[PDB]
């Protein structure tokens, strides 16, 4: 088949080791070869390839392209790709090149507007250009793809089983004034914390992640749901520590630690690993870890429960990584590993490879990042079969253990509380009065029915 002159149509230049390299040890997926690197021209060509569709390349490209190509430039490139000049045998060229390449362009626009609409929300002119382009597309073959794109565009500009019974302990429904770590039911604490943290996990989009934006000076602007999620986790860890060290009487503090291990147990049963690691981080903090007299009275079974949870974090999360691979939704993964891996993938690989003196976009690094964001999306799909309790949810949304203090002042206060309630040997252990009027016994972590 005979194409136009590269002079008139840039996407007609043949492949060479100066414009596209493939991965030479990866099995192709569905017969398609894996692109390693390429000029942006060649990456656009393969994004809209006439021989076949490549949905996985399209997904990866639209998720990661902003590091090497701006949105206005990508729009100009796929418009240029769509406008194919002709070089009889035109019937062949029209049938096997122009028409399938144009369908690919429309498919790329459709996926762009459907799954990456934030580009258009942040650049109205980009949306103006896209609507203009779609309006110029006049053909019988493209009519219903054009119409479907318009439908999407206009839209964007705007359980099977029943859940278990909610559990109650000392605090009664509607009595928020008494809600607290020991007065709410530990099962229900774990459940409502899992609902909050699952919503927090599900709201994080790839746009807050690619480009390692959450680590840069504009993170509050580009990664607000991610940051809200992390700050919830930090808050719960600090509330756990605070509840422990501000309970100065030893017996009561043992009750507090034991109730926190019970919440961890239910976190494990729910596959809320963010919750598990909130507890584990609390137990590993300087103020709590040193409380030898408290852990001494923790029953051995709960020691083993905590021990299993803590061991998930050992050896760079080896057991956590296996456990998560083996479980099925719904769950709430710990996000920190994703963030470290995206950051080090982006920082530890070159933006560009060089071949015969020519610069090529390093695409396989982007593919690796898009694998990580895809793993995250896969756990965002399934929700929990659990009922919200608005008042418990509200109580945990508004936990503010730090109050008005700065981080250092507050963690120094926790550490000094720890030293007061259990002084360094050889200072004798003092006694402290009880602070709780109600019974400390736990209802346990098995439902009432």
């Amino acid at each position: 088949m005979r194409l136009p002159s590269a002079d008139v149509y840039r996407f007609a230049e043949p492949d060479s080791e100066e414009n596209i390299i493939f991965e030479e040890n990866m099995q192709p997926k569905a017969g398609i070869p894996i692109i390693k690197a390429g000029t942006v021209i060649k990456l656009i060509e393969r994004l809209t390839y006439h021989m076949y569709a490549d949905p996985n390349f399209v997904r990866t490209f639209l998720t990661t392209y902003r590091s090497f190509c701006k949105p206005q430039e990508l729009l100009s490139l796929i418009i240029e790709r769509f406008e194919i000049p002709e070089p009889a045998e035109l019937k062949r060229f029209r049938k096997e090149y122009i028409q399938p390449v144009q369908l690919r362009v429309l498919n790329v626009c459709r996926h762009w507007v459907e799954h990456h609409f934030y580009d258009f929300e942040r650049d109205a002119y980009l949306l103006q250009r896209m609507e203009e382009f779609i309006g110029t597309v006049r053909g019988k073959a493209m009519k219903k793809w054009v119409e479907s794109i318009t439908k999407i565009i206009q839209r964007k500009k705007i359980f099977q089983s029943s859940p278990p019974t909610v559990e109650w302990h000392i605090s009664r429904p509607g009595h928020i004034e008494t809600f607290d770590l020991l007065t709410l039911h530990p099962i229900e604490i774990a459940r409502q914390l899992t609902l909050l943290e699952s919503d927090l996990y599900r709201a994080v989009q790839p746009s807050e992640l690619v480009g390692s934006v959450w680590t840069k000076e504009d993170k509050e602007i580009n990664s607000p749901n991610l940051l809200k999620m992390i700050r919830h986790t930090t808050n719960l860890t600090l509330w756990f520590e605070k509840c422990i060290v501000e309970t100065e009487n030893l017996e009561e503090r043992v009750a507090v630690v034991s109730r926190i291990i019970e919440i961890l147990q239910v976190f494990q049963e729910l596959n809320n690993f963010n919750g598990v690691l909130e507890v584990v981080s609390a137990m590993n903090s300087s103020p709590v870890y040193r409380l030898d007299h408290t852990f001494e009275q923790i029953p051995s079974r709960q020691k083993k429960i905590l021990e299993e949870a803590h061991e998930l974090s050992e050896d760079h999360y080896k057991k956590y990584l296996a456990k998560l691979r083996s479980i099925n939704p719904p769950c709430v993964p710990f996000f920190g590993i994703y963030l470290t891996n995206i950051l080090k993938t982006e920082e530890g690989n070159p933006e560009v490879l060089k071949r015969h003196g020519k610069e090529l976009i390093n695409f396989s690094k982007r593919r690796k990042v898009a694998e990580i964001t895809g793993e995250i999306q896969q756990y965002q799909n399934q929700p929990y079969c659990l009922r919200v309790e608005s008042d418990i949810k509200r109580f945990f949304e508004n936990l503010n253990p730090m109050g008005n203090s700065m981080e250092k002042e507050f963690t120094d206060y926790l550490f000094n509380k720890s030293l007061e309630i259990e002084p360094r040997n050889p200072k004798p252990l003092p006694r402290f009065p009880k602070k709780y009027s109600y019974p400390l016994k736990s209802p346990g972590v098995r439902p009432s029915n």
């Binding site: 030898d292 852990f295 020691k303």
Partner: peptide, 7 residues
């Protein structure tokens, strides 16, 4: 030995 929660 080890962690305050090691049996």
């Amino acid at each position: 030995x080890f962690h305050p929660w090691s049996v």
